[PDB]
Amino acid sequence: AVNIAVREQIEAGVGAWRLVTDYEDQSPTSNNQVIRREPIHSACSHVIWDSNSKLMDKSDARHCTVIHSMSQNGWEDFAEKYDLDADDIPSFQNPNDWVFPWLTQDTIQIAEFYEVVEKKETAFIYQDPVTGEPVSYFKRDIKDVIDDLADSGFIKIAERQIKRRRVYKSIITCTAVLKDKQLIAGEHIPIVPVFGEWGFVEDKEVY
Amino acid sequence: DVVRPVVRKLVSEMRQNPIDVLYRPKDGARPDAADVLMGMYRTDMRHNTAKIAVNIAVREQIEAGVGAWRLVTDYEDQSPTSNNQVIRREPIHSACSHVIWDSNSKLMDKSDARHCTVIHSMSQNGWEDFAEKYDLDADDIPSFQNPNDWVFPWL
Amino acid sequence: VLETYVFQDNLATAMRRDGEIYQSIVNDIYDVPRNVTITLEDGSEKDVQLMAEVVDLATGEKQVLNDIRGRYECYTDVGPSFQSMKQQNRAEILELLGKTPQGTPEYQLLLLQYFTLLDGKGVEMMRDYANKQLIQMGVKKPETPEEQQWLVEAQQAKQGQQDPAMVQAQGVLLQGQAELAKAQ
Amino acid sequence: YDVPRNVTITLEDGSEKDVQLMAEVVDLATGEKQVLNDIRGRYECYTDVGPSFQSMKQQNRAEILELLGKTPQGTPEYQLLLLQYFTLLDGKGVEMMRDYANKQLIQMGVKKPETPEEQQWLVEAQQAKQGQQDPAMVQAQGVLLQGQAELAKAQ
Amino acid sequence: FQSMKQQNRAEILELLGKTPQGTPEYQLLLLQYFTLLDGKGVEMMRDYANKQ
Questions:
Q1: Which among C17, C27, C58 has the least Cβ separation from residue A145?
Q2: CA atoms within 13 A on the CB side of A122
Q3: Alpha-carbon gap, residue A150 to C66, rounded angstroms
Q4: CA angle C120, C121, C125 (to 5 degrees)
Q5: Chain B interface mutation, best of E38, E42, E47, highest count of B Cβ atoms under 10 Å
Q6: B55, B59, B148 ranked by CB distance to A202: nearest
Q7: For the packed helices B35-44 and D56-69, what is the interaxial angle rounded to 10 degrees?
Q8: Sign of CA dihedral B136, B138, B142, B148
Q9: How far is CA C30 from the centre of its chain?
Q10: Which positions are tagged coiled coil (chain C)?
Q11: Is-contact D67 E13, C-beta < 8 A?
């Protein structure tokens, strides 16, 4: 993925990555899960960053759209992986053209919409019995399932509001949204852009 | 092109020698008075935004001849620099037309300037985001002098 | 004009953003142990790490982590790529060796490099030798009881057996002339 | 921001020596929020220009490296090398070297032990240096002092 | 120079460049460590030079 981004940055001027979470039962990194860095080909046309972002790393962007071009069997694989209806063929804006007379070109294309929202959240303050007076801080949105179990051993000292960012992914088509607001683990948009001669000239991005 | 390689070389040369503030104590100050403020400056100005802003200003100075920054205050509840607040250095693009300095200022750093106007160009969704952030009425679309022209046939 | 320097620094900023995103994902899904170095008892056990980890097993199904807000204790930076932590430590030791003259720290660094050497048993002999040397010097803390035995052997060998030569001879003279005092 | 002030004090009958306290004063409003407390003695630092560093530890490491480049291979060279090992990187691969440098610096007495294990190391260094490391020729010649004083006593 | 400490440091560096490696060289090195920068990373050397 890094080499692909470097080659595209040398040639096209822009490259991108994607950090995804996955469950690995045998030899996991931690918590029965692993993190991998999948590549993105043709990041110029397959990654559509927010137009209001004024940073090279695109950290100011509050949303990002990634267009996926996959074959048919790839489409059933995607539907099985994300629990989608493979019968309904998706459609989206064609990131690629047909200037070269390719014998065949991909038709099934679908897009995933990343968005990040910064809002204050409720975090419970707990007392870890092992450490001893540690004023441990945990967020309610994460441990809403085990509030009761944590109370069986921990002491809820108080309540506090902590502002944090949450990333939501929604698989979209031009006619309907198949998946809406699936919470993503990360606090930032996983796509990492790589740029070359980046800059703004007339409020228009030029790389 | 015969000029662009020169600009690239100048930008690379300016980037190979990074510069940052280095606070030092006064003549009569304590031998360790400047450590805490310097450490907090390193804490705030170590993210990608500060480096990107400096690089943008340097590139514009090489090419256009002028560049600008902007230091804003913000509240960070998790991992704050100090007093539940952090300082960041976001960039300003096209500082020639998007930053309107006072005409009576006779200093390069513009410290004599008694007022300054910064023109913001944002998309519609950016407009609603700005209105929500500053508690403004998003329905009333604002208008101001256009810093940029339409000489190039942008779509 | 390296020519690929601005393209190198842009890649470095991309790596920094990747590190920030990875840190966020780790704090959100991974289990991050917290070092709780303690000095329990009447000053006993010294300063030793414990690497405390807190996990809750839900009665219904699955487990969800427990991470405190003290998570952003690391700032992203840019460095050479390494396949594992052992390679990183080996590179650190090699750089320090290049930054150190041939003194006692040079031998210390060489032995520490031998500590983090590769897996093959062809160098197991030197791994064990470096372990023993560092432990006998007392710089290393013995964990397994054979290392404690090596440390004890080193203490017995150094104390008493390695009597200073000229100091002890002059102490001989001290005793003898004190006897001359006693006999006047 | 909250700027602590160094209030180094020598309370008691000259005890506690010169140690920093880093006093910080904050007021928690009864209504809501807090307001800082900063004196006019705030401009004790003058801005300068230096190389950019990600953190203060890197700045101190660069300082020590420059001093090493500016110092010949004497006792200060060893002191600087040990201090460079003091501010080494995070990995536990150099934890042994960090501990060794700390122990050496404390045994030479230049460093002030904070944690009681460092105080124990200093105590062991004092016991080893005093008495155990008897000067050789000086002790032999003191032997001669004693013996010929006995020759005096016996005439 | 930005301040008096920088001027004194430059004076000491020039005098070191004008002195062979004798007792005055050690004296000048210690005096340079006296007027060293603000960070506590060199506080140990400042204290050691003062004590010496």
A1: C58
A2: 7
A3: 10
A4: 125
A5: E38
A6: B148
A7: 120
A8: positive
A9: 25
A10: none
A11: no
Dihedral sign (CA D3, D8, D11, D16): positive
Distance CA A21, CA A189 (A): 13
Dihedral sign computed on CA atoms, order C125, C131, C134, C137? negative
Beta bridge partners of B20: D50
- How far apart CA A57 and CA C53 sit, in angstroms, is 33
C165 within 8 A of C183, measured Cβ to Cβ: no
Residue C130 near residue C115, CB atoms below 8 Å:
yes
Name the pairing type of β-strands A155-172 and B20-21.
unpaired
Residue A190 CB partners (closer than 8 Å, separation 6+): A17, A18, A19, A20, A114, A167, A184, C21, C25
Both structure tokens of C81: 């790529």
Phi-psi category of A13—alpha, beta or left, where left has phi over 0 and alpha has psi -120 to 50?
left
Q: How far apart are CA B72 and CA B133, in angstroms?
A: 13
The number of C-beta contacts closer than 8 angstroms across A and C is: 110
Q: CA-nearest residue of chain C to B4?
A: C1
Whole-angstrom distance, CA of residue C112 vs CA of residue D93: 8
Q: Measured in Å, how far apart are chain D's first and last C-alpha atoms?
A: 82
Distance between CA A38 and CA A68 in Å, rounded?
Answer: 13
Instruction: Round to whole Å and give the CA distance between B145 and C53.
Output: 58
Q: What share of chain E is helix, strand, coil (3-state, %, to 5)?
A: 75, 0, 25
Nearest to E33 by CA among B88, D68, A183, C150: D68
User: B73 forms bridges with which residues in the sheet?
Assistant: B87
Buried residues in D45-54 as b, exposed as e (16+ CB within 10 A): beeeeeebbb
Backbone angles phi, psi at A195, to 5 degrees: -120, 165
What is d(CA B58, CA B67) in angstroms, rounded to the nearest whole number? 7
Cβ-based contacts of D99 with chain C (< 8 Å): 139
Cα–Cα distance for residue pair A142/A123, rounded to 1 Å: 9
Residue A51, judged by CB atoms within 10 A of its CB (0-12, 13-18, 19+), counts as middle
CB D71 within 8 Å of CB E16: no
Contact A39, A81 (CB under 8 A): no
Distance from CA of D45 to the nearest CA of C (A): 26
CA distance A149 to chain C (A): 7
Q: Tell me the count of D-E CB pairs closer than 8 A.
A: 39
Q: What six digits make up the tokens of B30?
A: 């304590």
What DSSP string runs through A99-129? -S--S-----EEEEEEEEEEEEEEEEEEE-T
- Which three-class secondary structure state does DSSP give residue C124? helix
Burial label, A8 (beta-carbon count in 10 A; 0-12, 13-18, 19+): buried
Give the tokens for residue A131. Answer: 């450490």
Cβ contacts of B32 on chain E, cutoff 8 Å:
38-40, 43
